[PDB]
Amino acid sequence: GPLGSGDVQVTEDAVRRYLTRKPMTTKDLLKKFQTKKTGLSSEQTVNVLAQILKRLNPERKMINDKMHFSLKE
Ligand SMILES: [Zn+2]
């Protein structure tokens, strides 16, 4: 985030904030949750993101022939 701000926890609330702004892939979301901020490894981060997305069940939107998740429209 600006000036090195960025999420320090990987949560449903944080994912919801991003997916309500624009559709995003899993790769796109992972970029928002950086080890330098959270202290979680890439494996730990992808695993809890998977849990969050399974629960949230956001709408799938196909963009560039790739599934994106969206909480907008
Ligand atoms: Zn995309």
* Domains of the chain as residue ranges with CATH: 1-73 (1.10.10.10)
Radius of gyration, alpha carbons of the chain: 12
Q: Measure the CA–CA gap between 66 and 73, rounded to whole angstroms.
A: 18
Method used to determine the 3D structure: X-ray
**d(CA 64, ligand 1 centre) in Å:** 7
Structure tokens at 38: 């959270």
The residues facing 62 across adjacent strands are 67
**d(CA 63, ligand 1 centre) in Å:** 6
**Is 43 known as a binding-site position?**
no
The set of residues, in sequence order, having a beta carbon less than 8 Å from that of 16 and lying 6+ positions away, is 56, 71
**d(CA 59, ligand 1 centre) in Å:** 14
Q: Measure the CA–CA gap between 72 and 43, rounded to whole angstroms.
A: 28
Nearest-10 Cα torsion for 5, 12, 69, 32: 20
The set of residues, in sequence order, having a beta carbon less than 8 Å from that of 63 and lying 6+ positions away, is 23
What is the DSSP pairing of strand 66-70 with strand 59-63? antiparallel
The residues facing 70 across adjacent strands are 59
**Is 12 known as a binding-site position?**
no
